[PDB]
Write a protein that binds this ligand. Structure first.
Ligand SMILES: Cc1cc2nc3c(=O)[nH]c(=O)nc-3n(C[C@H](O)[C@H](O)[C@H](O)COP(=O)(O)O)c2cc1C
Ligand SMILES: Cc1cc2nc3c(=O)[nH]c(=O)nc-3n(C[C@H](O)[C@H](O)[C@H](O)CO)c2cc1C
Ligand code: SF4
Ligand code: SF4
Ligand code: SF4
Ligand code: SF4
Ligand code: SF4
Ligand code: SF4
Ligand code: SF4
Ligand code: SF4
Ligand code: SF4
Ligand code: SF4
Ligand code: FES
Ligand code: NA
Ligand code: NA
Ligand code: NA
Lengths: 443, 196, 207, 318, 191, 333
């Protein structure tokens, strides 16, 4: 096959410690006994509960109704009874309204779930209706609704669909297992998305450290001449939806105009697999993959776990704590969010749990700038982080805006390479927040 | 009451050299000794007094369209008379300050004071203002000249201090040796103004 | 049409604007010339007095002086092959009871650090330099202005037969050797060139 | 009832291994062989001077950082680098107080009056040398370089070239290795030891090839266009020390790749302008110091292009 | 060839601001930004270039063959003031009104010690017409270059952290001293 | 001697005379910028003539105002009086409604509201808000890193040893520079004559707030029953006082079980302190004003009344036709 290559300019080379869980087989979680389902598992308008305390629910039964257009429903992961419709701690640090369900032991399927159909019988309107009804959001991390993404406005033109298989953050190997095991579902989901949008071109981009996944995808594609696979060089910011576009297609997204103005539609391999599975079976989104790894975990592994299970249950299922942890992170080490407690349930965009020990979580105090200039070299947007940080640190928002601080993608790289151990990306975030806020109180 | 305040604004409160930063060419040019600064200050004081009194005497007939040509004529006349007298009786001071004695007419502090305090006040306030500004200029120039001369020559007022084998810092009597010193002095004053 | 016919009276104030200025200017002149009438000549006297002192200190004795008509000076400058003209200013002859005494020559040599200096040299009857002095200079006060100090006193004693050579060393070697000032070498060469031109003038004249 | 007491912060949660102190220690390691050659050639007084300078620098910094109520960050090994580089710019016949005065001027005035490390716009070790040369010209010119045991040299190689006496100059191999009668500054006589240690900083990634290559190419071209020897002009004087170690200062050089090419061309042109038609035998220090002033003007015209911002033309605010 | 050497010596070897201590008050006053520095340099260039020829003509046509040499300063300053008045009249009308942020330094273009200084230097050096024009243009270009470099440095300084007490004028004077050393590098050149 | 005076006088007079006519003609043709009427603001300004305000010329307060392109208080040297004069040339200013100060509605100081975790980063409030909102137990309280102190231009805020800011009432001049700089929306503006403020910003229910802080609001509603002028309301699970209707009766202060309302019990208790000079023995206060506290017989002057009752609202100070009652705060301490 014609496997082409591509790369971009800038970036860094982290240690890439993925070797620990790559050769370990795939594990399956046990049956849960209690689930907490929040009312906001996406971005947009939160849902409204339609269940009461003491009610009896099925598996796959809707417990939340969308409010506006950018809103997806919420379903139940187990079969049991409702014990609380109060608010519980969330991954953002503050309590969010949720529904608590206690499991019964049996998984009784709702008596209204049937297969939607076949690829040749569905067409675009029914495909979009099925995607909306199953509550599928973006599994890449942003959790943007999919049915909004597949509804192209009439004043825009697109001609290709690109799947993001370039999983680049360290410690994470869920997409590797998904591509190695379920390539046929990924191809079927790509075909379904291509038919829904109405294009005749499709690309898949996989990094070169997953050659077995590339071979599996090439074998699964078959004799179709409209599908292509690209082998990409191993770099950290490679998969951030923009450098992927530059490497595969060669185009550049304009200054604040979204990828839809470049003529492409970017999706994830997990979303495509979920679309194919929901078409074949008829069940909603209630289960995904996770990677439980780190320095304070006895037996790290990749495990398939339902939605609503607390973090502590996963940690207990993966051995436990070998030592006292000093940091718990939801996601990767480069863009994850540190937690306060371990009562947090897993969500639709939770791709890993990373526990660090006390010695490995220590960073020295920031010092003076020495004007080395490495942060300028490593930036993929070709900005100058030192000037923006120094202007933000003394409350000069006009100079921050004049230095093009609103097109930073917050990728971490600039703060990783600093010899003086500074916090450049945090200052850039502060400047961006203030610039955005000043546009509403002055207009 | 109104006479002592104008006289005593002068040195401390509104020093032209340390607080207004005006007239910086003679200050950095001639202050290589403790004698040149005093003579320059006295000449500038005489010119300032004469020009201020003359301009304040005639603040009713000069229109606002020919003001600066009317001012510079009086200032240049006083400067020329003072220069003729100095060349007649003090040739050494004229030779030591050769170019900047014709240049007293443009000193950045005479025209500014004439515009500010001479075209809107009486005859008695302008005299006190001129006396105070001249005293402040003379004191600042003398201090800077003594400080530079002690380090760059090893003597004060022509009297040696460090012996006949001292090797001076020959940068303090150079153009780059002025700027830095003055800056440090100003900084010190600012510190003692803001921490007290 | 004068920007839409400015209304008459705009000219009437014009005669008011000039006249006062005119008066002021006249008054200024009415001062300055008077001061000049009291001052200028006196200044001239002082100048010549200094020059007289400059002529008397270099050749210390009780004698009279006579001035060359300044066309013989130009003839000497034309002869002997003096490659740059108008660098010789004044030549005077001393007289002490009939017999000749010496000569006093003023010259402005170029190629200094900051332009032209003025050097005066006095020579006796037999060739001996009895002292030199600096009349005008515009060099650095702490670096090139030291020529009018103890550096001049070493110029006495040198015979008027050959030229002089400047050396960069503490040791003075022997005859016709001049030790320059540390950190100041161009001024010493300029003064030596002026002395050499004066001594060439003396050699050409005294034969 | 056991709590956890975790740590909360912002991304990223991992960092690199290099820091500020490692860079300066690597600079000292690179500068060691020149110190060895200087100690072998000039004797035991060539080392002691260096020590004096180092001590003074460190002491000065500590005192200031005690008086202004600031953390004493003397363990970043920056004042040691400044002291060593200043001590490499001295003759062998210098008194002990010259190094102390130079170190005090370099640390107190140039560096600490503008904020501290990385916040000045000028080179401290070259400005201190320029101040010392102007203040005390007798202790630094043409005679302090020759040792007292040698009485037949009387001139350094760069002073025998401006007078046309190129028949009494040392050989080109002796000017390159630095032995057999080559005199000058204590840490400049060997171009073989300043290139071995200069190629070690390129391999570790501290400096790049751009400034060292373009500084040396312009000197060779200029000496070729006027009919002189390209090699004698590169292995004599303070050019190899300035190209690899002093023109590559972090706080005085441009940060982009296009400005570091324009900067080096000017640094190489002003050197040979002063060398051939000037009042000094060598003009490396002032050529480097004059390009530290024009650096903020080069940086505003040599910026790069932001991703996605292609526009049409340079309309800007018109 | 002599005109080129005169221009070069006026711009580099004998810069008016750093060496001769003439244009210092606008140097510290106006150099907080680049655009104002460029505008002030252009205005100063125009004023000097127009004043030099008029001063030459007035001195050598009237004062010399009349024995009235003591009226040099008053006539020269009258001519310069009358020129700067017209410059002030033309600048504020058509050139942007926001440029009147000099704040006293615009009527100090009359004062501006470099202008009368270069006029007296041209008079005392016994030049010709074209030599005076070239000297005036060279002095103006040197002033413009110095003020542009200062305005460029001060923004990098605004990035840095002066402690609390130096701030405006002391750090400007220290920067000027360091630039004066860097230009003391340009010395001893025979042109 | 005649020529030596005639020639320079003539030359200088001609030179001066031609230049005056030249400048008079140059008044026309060139600059005609007179079209903004200048003599509006040239005397109310004290006069400094500095380029730290914009306004290219200190007499340029004639085209800078009539378009709204410049702020009313753009001149700091002139001050409040000069700004008021400039505005009252057109109007708006020279008004009423006293002066205000800045206050902090929080009283949890590092021992009653401890920290959940440890925070690494820059010591600033907004930088701490980047790190998932902060590390405090109460998600609505003061972080304590002092952004408001850093943004204050008049040096009126100091950070105490307990973590909460303190404002000097003599250096604070009624602005909002510290109000929009607080990420927690805690700094507020309060009249200087007010001493009853509800100091909390917690929007949780009773048990969670009780666990979070010692002096939290549990929204019990006991402070609304005590008030009868309808000035304090409980909304969003938090109480708030309206300062336009508060009579400072100090009745709600004693009824709060968690000590959230500021103020001390030293108030009122002066029931009909009536001056004998200007009352006509009307006896209209003897009947009722909602409490009795007056009862007597006709009350010919001097009034015989015992003072051990009433709440001291203040309505009886202005409803009288002659206002013979005097209000004096006299209690313990
Ligand atoms: C620094 C950075 C790295 C990212 N890395 C990945 C990645 O490795 N894989 C991925 O699927 N999305 C990644 N994303 C998210 C993409 O930008 C994009 O939102 C995603 O492809 C959308 O997938 P969806 O359409 O399924 O929501 C990254 C984003 C950023 C800012
Ligand atoms: C590559 C490199 C070169 C340096 N060069 C110099 C130099 O030439 N002079 C100096 O005083 N310090 C030098 N330093 C150290 C100095 O403390 C720092 O770079 C800043 O110039 C201090 O403001 C150098 C440091 C590095 C890493
Ligand atoms: S990487 Fe850090 S130390 Fe280097 S220039 Fe950037 S901010 Fe400064
Ligand atoms: S976080 Fe922003 S500034 Fe830093 S390297 Fe990434 S894109 Fe550049
Ligand atoms: S602060 Fe007021 S008085 Fe001072 S210059 Fe500005 S407007 Fe004029
Ligand atoms: S009041 Fe607000 S800004 Fe001030 S310290 Fe507290 S949280 Fe920070
Ligand atoms: S910022 Fe303004 S309102 Fe706040 S404390 Fe300071 S002076 Fe008062
Ligand atoms: S509960 Fe109220 S008083 Fe206590 S910390 Fe929170 S906001 Fe402050
Ligand atoms: S009485 Fe106190 S605790 Fe109860 S609602 Fe009122 S303020 Fe809150
Ligand atoms: S003080 Fe009195 S009026 Fe004010 S809120 Fe409390 S009870 Fe109501
Ligand atoms: S006038 Fe007032 S005080 Fe007198 S009786 Fe009537 S209510 Fe009472
Ligand atoms: S304070 Fe109020 S209740 Fe008391 S006497 Fe006066 S009006 Fe009546
Ligand atoms: S420029 Fe101000 S006195 Fe010379
Ligand atoms: Na005027
Ligand atoms: Na002057
Ligand atoms: Na000024």
């Amino acid at each position: 096959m014609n496997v082409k290559h591509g790369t971009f300019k800038g970036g860094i080379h982290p240690p890439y410690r993925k070797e620990s869980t790559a050769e370990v087989p795939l594990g399956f979680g046990k049956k849960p006994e209690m689930v907490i389902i929040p009312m906001s598992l996406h971005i947009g308008a939160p849902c409204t509960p339609i269940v009461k305390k003491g009610d009896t629910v099925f598996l796959g039964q809707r417990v939340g109704e969308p409010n506006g257009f950018v809103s997806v429903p919420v379903h139940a992961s187990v079969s049991g009874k409702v014990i609380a419709v109060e608010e519980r701690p969330h991954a953002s640090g503050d309590r969010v309204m949720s529904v608590v369900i206690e499991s019964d032991g049996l998984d009784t399927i709702d008596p209204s779930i049937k297969p939607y159909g076949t690829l040749e019988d569905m067409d675009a309107d029914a495909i979009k209706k099925m995607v909306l009804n199953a509550g599928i959001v973006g599994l890449g991390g942003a959790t943007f609704p999919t049915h909004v993404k597949l509804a192209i406005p009439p004043d825009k033109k697109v001609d290709c669909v690109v799947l993001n298989g370039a999983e680049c953050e360290p410690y994470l190997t869920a997409d590797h297992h998904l591509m190695t095991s379920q390539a046929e579902k990924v191809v079927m989901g790509l075909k379904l998305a291509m038919k829904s949008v109405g294009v005749e071109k499709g690309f898949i981009g996989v990094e070169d450290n997953k050659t077995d996944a590339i071979e599996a995808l090439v074998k699964a594609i078959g004799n179709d001449s409209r599908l292509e696979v690209y082998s990409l060089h191993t770099k950290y910011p490679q998969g951030a939806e923009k450098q992927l576009i530059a490497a595969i297609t060669g185009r550049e997204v304009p200054s604040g105009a979204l990828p839809a103005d470049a003529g492409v539609v970017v999706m994830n391999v997990g979303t495509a697999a979920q679309i194919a599975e929901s078409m074949i079976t008829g069940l909603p989104l209630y289960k995904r993959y996770l990677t439980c790894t780190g320095d304070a975990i006895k037996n790290p592994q990749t495990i398939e776990i339902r939605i609503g299970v607390p973090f502590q249950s996963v940690i207990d299922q993966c051995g436990g704590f070998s030592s006292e942890p000093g940091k718990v992170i939801s996601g990767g080490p480069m863009m994850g969010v540190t937690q306060f407690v371990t009562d947090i349930p897993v969500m639709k965009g939770t791709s890993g749990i990373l526990c660090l020990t006390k010695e490995s979580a220590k960073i020295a105090t920031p010092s003076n700038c020495i004007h080395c200039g490495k942060c300028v070299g490593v930036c993929p947007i070709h900005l100058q982080p030192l000037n923006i940080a120094e202007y933000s640190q003394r409350n000069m928002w006009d100079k921050c805006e004049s230095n093009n601080a609103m097109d930073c993608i917050e990728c971490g790289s600039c703060s990783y390479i600093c010899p003086a151990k500074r916090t450049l990306v945090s200052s850039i975030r502060v400047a961006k927040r203030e610039i955005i806020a000043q546009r509403r109180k002055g207009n | 009451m109104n006479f002592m305040k104008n006289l005593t604004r002068g040195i401390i409160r509104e020093n032209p050299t340390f607080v207004l930063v005006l007239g910086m060419c003679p200050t950095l040019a001639v202050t290589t000794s403790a004698i040149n600064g005093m003579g320059m200050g006295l000449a500038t004081m005489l010119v300032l007094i004469g020009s201020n009194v003359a301009i304040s005497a005639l603040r009713k007939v000069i229109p606002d369209n020919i003001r600066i040509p009317a001012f510079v004529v009086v200032i240049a006349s006083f400067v020329t008379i003072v220069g003729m007298l100095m060349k007649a009786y003090v040739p050494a001071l004229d030779a030591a300050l050769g170019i900047f004695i014709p240049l007293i007419v443009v000193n950045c502090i005479i025209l500014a004071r004439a515009e500010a305090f001479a075209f809107s006040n009486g005859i008695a306030d302008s005299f006190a203002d001129a006396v105070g500004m001249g005293l402040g200029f003379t004191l600042a120039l003398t201090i800077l000249g003594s400080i530079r001369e002690i380090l760059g020559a090893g003597s004060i007022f022509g009297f040696s201090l460090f012996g006949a084998a001292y090797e001076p810092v020959l940068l303090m009597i150079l153009p780059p040796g002025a700027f830095l010193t003055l800056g440090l002095l100003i900084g010190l004053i600012n510190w003692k103004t803001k921490k007290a | 049409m004068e920007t839409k016919e400015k209304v008459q009276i705009d000219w009437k104030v014009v005669f008011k604007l000039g006249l006062i200025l005119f008066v002021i200017s006249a008054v200024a002149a009415c001062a300055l010339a008077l001061t000049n009438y009291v001052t200028a000549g006196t200044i001239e006297e002082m100048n010549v007095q200094t020059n007289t002192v400059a002529r008397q200190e270099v050749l210390p004795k009780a004698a009279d002086f006579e001035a060359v008509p300044a066309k013989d000076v130009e003839k000497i400058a034309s002869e002997i092959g003096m490659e740059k003209p108008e660098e010789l200013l004044e030549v005077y002859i001393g007289k002490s009871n009939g017999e000749v005494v010496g000569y006093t020559v003023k010259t402005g040599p170029t190629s200094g650090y900051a332009g032209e200096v003025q050097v005066l040299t006095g020579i006796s009857a037999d060739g001996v330099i009895t002292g030199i002095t600096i009349i005008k200079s515009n060099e650095t006060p702490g670096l090139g202005a030291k020529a009018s100090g103890v550096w001049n006193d070493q110029f006495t004693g040198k015979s008027a037969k050959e030229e002089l050579v400047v050396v960069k060393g503490t040791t003075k070697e022997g005859s016709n050797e001049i030790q320059a000032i540390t950190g100041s070498t161009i001024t010493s060469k300029a003064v030596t060139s002026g002395v050499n031109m004066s001594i060439q003038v003396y050699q050409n004249l005294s034969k | 009832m056991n709590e956890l007491n975790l740590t909360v912060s912002s991304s990223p949660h991992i960092r690199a291994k290099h820091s500020t102190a490692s860079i300066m220690q690597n600079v000292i390691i690179a500068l060691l062989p020149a110190l060895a050659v200087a100690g072998y050639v000039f004797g035991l007084w060539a080392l002691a001077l260096v020590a004096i300078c180092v001590i003074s620098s460190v002491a000065t910094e500590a005192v200031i950082q005690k008086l202004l109520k600031k953390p004493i960050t003397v363990n970043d090994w920056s004042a040691v680098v400044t002291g060593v580089l200043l001590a490499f710019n001295l003759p062998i016949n210098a008194p002990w107080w010259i190094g102390v005065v130079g170190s005090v001027f370099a640390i107190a005035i140039v560096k600490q009056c503008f904020g501290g490390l990385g916040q000045n716009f000028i080179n401290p070790a070259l400005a201190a040398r320029a101040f010392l040369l102007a203040s005390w010209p007798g202790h630094m010119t043409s005679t302090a370089y020759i040792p007292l045991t040698d009485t037949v040299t009387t001139a350094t190689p760069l002073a025998l070239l401006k007078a046309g006496e190129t028949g009494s100059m040392p050989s080109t191999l002796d000017l390159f290795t630095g032995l057999n009668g080559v005199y000058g500054c204590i840490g400049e006589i060997s171009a073989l030891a300043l290139l071995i240690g200069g190629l070690y900083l390129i391999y570790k990634g501290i400096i790049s090839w751009r400034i060292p290559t373009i500084y040396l190419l312009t000197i060779a071209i200029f000496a070729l266009l006027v009919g002189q020897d390209p090699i004698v002009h590169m292995v004599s004087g303070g050019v190899m020390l300035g190209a690899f170690f002093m023109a590559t200062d972090y706080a005085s050089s441009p940060v982009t790749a296009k400005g570091q090419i324009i900067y080096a061309i000017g640094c190489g042109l002003i050197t040979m302008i002063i060398r051939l038609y000037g009042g000094y035998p060598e003009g490396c220090s002032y050529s480097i110091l004059l390009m530290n002033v024009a650096t903020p003007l080069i940086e505003r015209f040599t910026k790069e292009r932001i991703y996605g911002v292609t526009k049409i033309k340079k309309e800007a605010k018109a | 060839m002599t005109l080129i050497f005169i221009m070069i010596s006026a711009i580099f070897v004998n810069n008016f601001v750093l060496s001769r201590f003439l244009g210092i008050c606008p140097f510290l006053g106006v150099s907080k930004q680049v655009e104002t520095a460029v505008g002030m340099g252009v205005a100063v260039t125009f004023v000097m270039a127009l004043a030099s020829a008029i001063t030459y003509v007035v001195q050598y046509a009237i004062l010399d063959p009349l024995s009235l040499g003591y009226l040099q300063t008053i006539a020269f300053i009258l001519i310069i003031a009358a020129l700067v008045q017209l410059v002030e009249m033309i600048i504020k009308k058509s050139s942007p009104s926001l440029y009147q942020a000099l704040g006293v330094y615009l009527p100090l273009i009359t004062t501006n010690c470099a202008v009368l200084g270069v006029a007296l230097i041209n008079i005392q050096n016994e030049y010709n017409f074209i030599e005076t024009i070239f000297n005036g243009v060279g002095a103006a270009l040197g002033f413009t270059l110095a003020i542009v470099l200062f305005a460029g440095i001060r923004e990098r300084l605004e990035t840095s952290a002066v402690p609390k007490a130096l701030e405006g004028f002391p750090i400007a004077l220290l920067t000027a001293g360091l630039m004066a050393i860097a230009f003391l590098g340009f010395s001893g050149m025979k042109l | 001697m005649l020529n030596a005076i005639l020639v320079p006088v003539g030359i200088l007079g001609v030179f001066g005379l031609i230049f005056g006519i030249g400048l008079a003609i140059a008044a026309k043709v060139f600059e005609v910028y007179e079209d903004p009427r200048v003599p509006l603001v040239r005397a109310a300004l004290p006069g400094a003539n500095c380029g730290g305000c914009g306004l290219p010329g200190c007499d340029a307060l004639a085209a800078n105002i009539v378009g709204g392109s410049a702020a009313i208080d753009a001149c700091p040297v002139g001050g409040a009086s000069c700004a008021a004069a400039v505005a009252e040339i057109m109007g708006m200013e020279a008004g009423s409604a006293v002066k205000k100060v800045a206050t902090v509605i929080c009283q949890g100081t590092c021992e009653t509201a401890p920290n959940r975790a440890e925070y690494y980063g820059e010591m600033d409030c907004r930088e701490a808000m980047i790190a998932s909102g902060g590390s405090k137990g109460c998600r609505y309280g003061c972080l304590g890193y002092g952004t408001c102190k850093a943004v204050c231009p008049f040096d009126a805020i100091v950070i105490g040893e307990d973590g909460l800011p303190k404002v000097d009432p003599e250096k604070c001049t009624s602005c909002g520079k510290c109000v929009e700089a607080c990420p927690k929306s805690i700094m507020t503006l309060v009249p200087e004559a007010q001493e009853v403020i509800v100091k909390c910003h917690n929007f949780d229910k009773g048990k969670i707030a009780r666990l979070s802080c010692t002096t939290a609001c549990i929204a019990c509603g006991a402070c609304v029953k005590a008030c009868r002028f309808d000035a304090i309301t409980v909304e969003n699970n938090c109480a708030k006082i309206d300062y336009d209707k508060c009579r400072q009766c100090y009745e709600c202060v004693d009824k709060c079980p968690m000590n959230c309302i500021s103020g001390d019990v030293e108030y009122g208790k002066s029931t009909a302190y009536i001056i004998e000079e200007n009352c006509i023995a009307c006896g209209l206060c003897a009947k009722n004003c909602p409490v009795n506290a007056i009862t007597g017989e006709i009350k010919k002057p001097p009034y015989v009344i015992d003072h051990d009752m009433c709440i001291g609202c203040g309505i009886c100070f202005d409803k009288c036709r002659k206002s013979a009652i005097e209000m004096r705060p006299n209690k313990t301490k």
